[PDB]
Design a protein around this ligand. Structure first.
Ligand code: HEM
Length: 185
């Protein structure tokens, strides 16, 4: 049911960490597993890893309200090298903290597949370690690009097809690319 995080979310075997945890990723397609979650959003992020800790900068844009928000997330990478659980705060466009982390919230990202300039991730949001909801996202290095077929193969294993996803390339997305490109610089 909506609210419980999906089963059969499998971390990629032997994800190349240096490649995945670099640069900027754009969401091109997403599927919130709650069918009533129909707000249109654009998303991009810059995840980095060092010494088994992930530090990432996040960017969301609400298409309807035209309001953006910025977060950073930090947490340990699992031994499998393709899954992490983060605590997060809220920052402004200059990276200054404007709201501190709320200890009760966390999220868990699984990198399911990565191929060429494409990837497939899943996020499970939690409150006090209990599932509150989840979403799948197809990522690309290029905003307007279609995913590698390996991403579709991965979707098919969890009984999903790409046509079910929201596509954002036609939406009025506005991005802060400098916030992400300047991450940790
Ligand atoms: C890829 C498609 C994604 C979409 C469409 C999306 C959409 C959203 C929406 C609608 C909200 C709630 C905003 C509000 O309450 O007004 C939100 C919040 C949030 N998302 Fe995402 N999200 C995506 C991916 C991600 C990913 C991959 C992460 C983590 C790596 C993430 C981390 C967060 C966090 C931490 C919040 C809470 C921000 C806050 O409360 O200040 N999101 N997202």
């Amino acid at each position: 049911l909506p609210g419980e995080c999906s089963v059969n979310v499998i971390p990629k075997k032997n994800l190349d960490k240096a490649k995945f945890f670099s640069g900027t990723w754009y969401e091109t397609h997403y599927l919130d597993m709650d069918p009533q979650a129909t707000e249109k959003f654009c998303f991009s992020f810059a995840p980095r890893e060092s010494g088994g800790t992930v530090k990432e900068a996040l960017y969301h844009f609400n298409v309807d309200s035209k309001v953006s928000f910025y977060n950073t997330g930090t947490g340990p990478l699992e031994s499998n090298g393709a899954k992490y659980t983060a605590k997060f705060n809220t920052v402004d466009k200059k990276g200054k903290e404007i709201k501190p982390a709320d200890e009760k919230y966390s999220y868990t990202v699984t990198v399911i597949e990565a191929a060429k300039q494409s990837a497939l991730i899943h996020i499970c949001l939690q409150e006090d370690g209990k599932d509150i909801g989840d979403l799948y996202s197809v990522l690309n290095r290029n905003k307007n690009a279609l995913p590698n077929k390996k991403i579709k193969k991965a979707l098919n294993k969890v009984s999903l097809v790409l046509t079910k996803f929201v596509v954002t390339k036609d939406l009025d997305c506005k991005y802060d690319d400098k916030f992400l490109s300047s991450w940790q610089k």
